[PDB]
Structure formats: C-alpha cells, structure tokens
Write an enzyme that holds these catalytic residues in place. Structure first.
Site, mmCIF file in Angstrom:
data_model
loop_
_atom_site.group_PDB
_atom_site.id
_atom_site.type_symbol
_atom_site.label_atom_id
_atom_site.label_comp_id
_atom_site.label_asym_id
_atom_site.label_seq_id
_atom_site.Cartn_x
_atom_site.Cartn_y
_atom_site.Cartn_z
ATOM 1 C CB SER A 3 -10.711 60.122 -22.715
ATOM 2 O OG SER A 3 -10.726 60.625 -20.895
ATOM 3 C CE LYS B 231 -14.548 60.959 -21.748
ATOM 4 N NZ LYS B 231 -13.605 61.507 -21.520
ATOM 5 C CB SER C 82 -12.187 64.757 -24.423
ATOM 6 O OG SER C 82 -11.779 63.019 -23.909
ATOM 7 C CD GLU D 205 -13.691 60.550 -17.986
ATOM 8 O OE1 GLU D 205 -12.747 60.516 -16.987
ATOM 9 O OE2 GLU D 205 -13.197 60.175 -18.666
ATOM 10 C CE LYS E 129 -12.720 60.460 -26.366
ATOM 11 N NZ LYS E 129 -11.276 61.587 -26.272
ATOM 12 C CB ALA F 131 -4.294 62.486 -21.411
#
Ligand SMILES: C[As](C)(=O)[O-]
Length: 263
Positions: free
Chosen positions: A45, A48, A105, A141, A209, A212
């Site tokens: 993530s 992002k 997230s 995602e 940010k 995981a």
C-alpha cells in the site's frame, strides 16, 4: 555513529528472520543511511502515495478536478473499504478518495483513482516524471499484494521511494497547494501508530503511509520533522520467507529508532 547504525541494522535483520530495506535521507545535508537500499521490495500500500500524488499533479492544470465525482457501486468494493463502503449508491470526489486511500488505506478508493488515472501504468509514468526509474505499479488492489520473491511487479527500492517521497513532500515535484495537501494527508494517517512512528520521539511531527501484504511484507514510508531540525525522509521495507508470515510492524519501529538516533 554511522558504523554502529550498520551493525545494529544487520543485527535487527538477523533477529527478524526476514529481509530488511532501509533508506533515510537527512535533508539537513542530504546525507543518507542505507541498508539494501537499492534492492527491490514489494511496495504494498505504500504505492498509494505515488497514486494520490499523480491525481494532485493533475489538479495543477485541471482546475477543480479534485472535486470531480466518481460513483461508488457494490461491484467496486474490495477486501478493504473502511470509507468507500459508506458511500455505496453515492459518489466520492477524487479528493475524498485520495484522503480515504492515504489515511485509512482504503483499497477501493485506490482502484477508483487508478481507474480515473487510466491504470497502474500511468502511476508509473508519473513516478518517471519526477525522476523515479525504479518504481513500477503493475496491478490494482488487491492483486498488487502478492509480493512473490523474485517478482519485480509492483516493487521499488527503499532509496528510490525515499527520493520520490522527498521530492513530493519537500521538493518541487508538486506545486505549493498540492504539496501542502499531500503533507497534511500524510500527517493525518491513522494506520501508522505501531510502525515508524513507534520508534520515534513522541513529539516529533510525522506524515506516513503504511503498507502490508503477502510474505509478511511490512512497509512504511515517512517524512519526519525532528523538533526544529531539518526534515528526515525514511523508508522502511521488510519482507519474509513465508507466504503467510505475519506482519512485523515492530521491526520497522526498531529500524526507525536505530537510524534516527541523535537526529
Ligand atoms: C489496508 As492495506 C493491509 O493494503 O495497507
């Protein structure tokens, strides 16, 4: 001192059972602290940030685009919709989407942004535009979370992400208004409490940010303001041998404590 930092990082990695990647840039003198800093790790993530920044960049030309709306439909939902799930059958602006994906997230918010941007390839294009030739976003995602060892898809290096985060938050990659918004969003992140932040003095100001994913990959990238001293840019990436390994946020906190000591 600089040699004890290296010894300590190596010890931390051995104790962790995984592979540690660290890159700290001290903007006071542009000095760097590196550990496997040129190695590739799955971004999870943390990608992002580059994505939300690509949108901010567009707002520099297309006035009011941050207020452009995108419908949120049940079919858009993913495995993580902390904010988006509240807007099903409603709309969210690119700004609200950027805020959701950065501070919570939200994976669905991320995909909406990718769709708006035209796909992962355009995020990579934006990274290239700010001088990052290492970063590469290949999937949306949650597919970008596979983090398969040896797989270069959706990866980058600690140093490359550190340099990019610096240009985006402190440098000239973005214009003043856009730059301020990104910094504010990062400072408002609600998912980094047990990561880099946990290894820093409580009063230091931080924007970050987390990330995981599979193979117990635990990441976090941040901009740090130590009291009234020049900002620090830190990237802590970590990945393990087992596909189902549990995340180790504590390892990132330990890496942070080590490289920011005396800063
Ligand atoms: C909500 As996530 C584990 O992709 O940062």
């Amino acid at each position: 001192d600089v040699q004890q930092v290296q010894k300590k990082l190596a010890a931390l990695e051995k104790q962790s059972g995984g592979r540690l990647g660290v890159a700290l840039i001290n903007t006071a003198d542009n000095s760097q602290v590196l550990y496997r800093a040129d190695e590739r790790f799955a971004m999870c993530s943390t990608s992002k940030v580059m994505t939300a920044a690509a949108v901010l960049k567009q707002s520099e030309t297309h006035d009011g685009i941050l207020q452009q709306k995108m419908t949120i439909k049940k079919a858009d939902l993913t495995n993580w919709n902390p904010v988006t799930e509240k807007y099903v059958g409603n709309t969210m602006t690119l700004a609200e989407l950027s805020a959701a994906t950065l501070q919570y997230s939200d994976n669905t918010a991320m995909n909406k942004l990718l769709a708006h941007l035209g796909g992962p390839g355009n995020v990579t294009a934006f990274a290239r535009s700010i001088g990052d030739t290492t970063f590469r976003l290949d999937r949306k995602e949650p597919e970008l979370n596979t983090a398969i060892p040896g797989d270069e898809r959706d990866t980058t290096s600690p140093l490359a992400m550190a340099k990019s985060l610096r240009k985006l938050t402190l440098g000239d990659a973005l214009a003043g208004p856009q730059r301020a918004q990104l910094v504010d969003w990062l400072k408002g992140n609600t998912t980094g409490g047990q990561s880099i932040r946990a290894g820093l003095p409580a009063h230091w100001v931080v924007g970050d940010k987390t990330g995981a994913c599979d193979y117990g990959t635990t990441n976090d990238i941040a901009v740090i303001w130590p009291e009234d001293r020049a900002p620090l840019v830190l990237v802590t990436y970590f990945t393990q041998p087992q596909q189902d390994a549990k995340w180790r946020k504590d390892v990132l906190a330990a890496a942070a404590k080590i490289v920011t000591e005396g800063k």
